[PDB]
Design an enzyme around this catalytic site. Structure first.
Site, PDB file in Angstrom:
ATOM      1  N   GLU A  35      24.477  64.194  54.195  1.00 33.65           N
ATOM      2  CA  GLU A  35      24.275  63.901  55.624  1.00 33.65           C
ATOM      3  C   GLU A  35      24.561  62.447  55.939  1.00 33.65           C
ATOM      4  O   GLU A  35      25.225  62.161  56.942  1.00 33.65           O
ATOM      5  CB  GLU A  35      22.867  64.286  56.047  1.00 33.65           C
ATOM      6  N   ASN A  46      28.327  63.988  68.104  1.00 36.91           N
ATOM      7  CA  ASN A  46      28.900  65.327  68.104  1.00 36.91           C
ATOM      8  C   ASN A  46      29.642  65.641  69.383  1.00 36.91           C
ATOM      9  O   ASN A  46      29.485  64.995  70.387  1.00 36.91           O
ATOM     10  CB  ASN A  46      27.732  66.291  67.986  1.00 36.91           C
ATOM     11  N   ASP A  48      29.316  68.003  71.344  1.00 39.09           N
ATOM     12  CA  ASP A  48      28.458  68.472  72.451  1.00 39.09           C
ATOM     13  C   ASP A  48      27.793  67.306  73.203  1.00 39.09           C
ATOM     14  O   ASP A  48      27.129  67.561  74.180  1.00 39.09           O
ATOM     15  CB  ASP A  48      27.417  69.546  72.041  1.00 39.09           C
ATOM     16  N   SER A  50      25.499  65.317  71.842  1.00 41.93           N
ATOM     17  CA  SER A  50      24.356  64.884  71.087  1.00 41.93           C
ATOM     18  C   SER A  50      24.799  63.944  69.961  1.00 41.93           C
ATOM     19  O   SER A  50      25.991  63.749  69.705  1.00 41.93           O
ATOM     20  CB  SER A  50      23.615  66.087  70.452  1.00 41.93           C
ATOM     21  N   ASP A  52      23.489  62.675  65.861  1.00 49.24           N
ATOM     22  CA  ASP A  52      22.615  62.845  64.665  1.00 49.24           C
ATOM     23  C   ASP A  52      22.239  61.478  64.153  1.00 49.24           C
ATOM     24  O   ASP A  52      23.051  60.557  64.057  1.00 49.24           O
ATOM     25  CB  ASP A  52      23.392  63.581  63.582  1.00 49.24           C
ATOM     26  N   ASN A  59      19.187  65.724  65.019  1.00 50.60           N
ATOM     27  CA  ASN A  59      19.991  65.781  66.230  1.00 50.60           C
ATOM     28  C   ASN A  59      19.168  65.599  67.513  1.00 50.60           C
ATOM     29  O   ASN A  59      18.099  66.190  67.679  1.00 50.60           O
ATOM     30  CB  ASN A  59      20.658  67.192  66.210  1.00 50.60           C
TER      31      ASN A  59
END
Ligand SMILES: [Cl-]
Ligand SMILES: [Cl-]
Ligand code: NA
Length: 129
Positions: A35, A46, A48, A50, A52, A59
């Site tokens: 990660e 991301n 969308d 959002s 992380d 997220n």
């Protein structure tokens, strides 16, 4: 903070993540490596909109507030910046909520694709734990 492998394993154990919800410590260390590369300051946006955050790439659509993820929620009740700290407490507490949300560690796509089913015990081998 960029953790060493055994250093992070120890910190995760002291915060109760080892075998949390049945996921042995190596699962968590493996997930963190893929990660974030063990970097507490990692961020990744991301498609969308959002983002992380932190060592476990939590997220903003569900789990933390960053002020710029419409329509999103803050179920860990924290600013996403809290997930970037040297101290992993906030990330561990929030990860406990995520892994309890129904799909276990499949909530981390990188765990499913890179750690699930592998010899995750290798991630803690040698560590004084
Ligand atoms: Cl393990
Ligand atoms: Cl499970
Ligand atoms: Na949010």
């Amino acid at each position: 903070k960029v953790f060493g492998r055994c250093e992070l394993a120890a910190a995760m154990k002291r915060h109760g993540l080892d075998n949390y919800r049945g996921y042995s410590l190596g699962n968590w260390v493996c997930a963190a490596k893929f990660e974030s590369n063990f970097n507490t300051q990692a961020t990744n946006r991301n498609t969308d909109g959002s983002t992380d955050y932190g060592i476990l790439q939590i997220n903003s659509r569900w789990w933390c507030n960053d002020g710029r993820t419409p329509g999103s929620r803050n179920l860990c009740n924290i600013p996403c910046s809290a997930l970037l700290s040297s101290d992993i407490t906030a990330s561990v507490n929030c990860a406990k909520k995520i892994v309890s949300d129904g799909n276990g560690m499949n909530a981390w796509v990188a765990w499913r694709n890179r750690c699930k089913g592998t010899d995750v015990q290798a991630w803690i081998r040698g560590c004084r734990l």
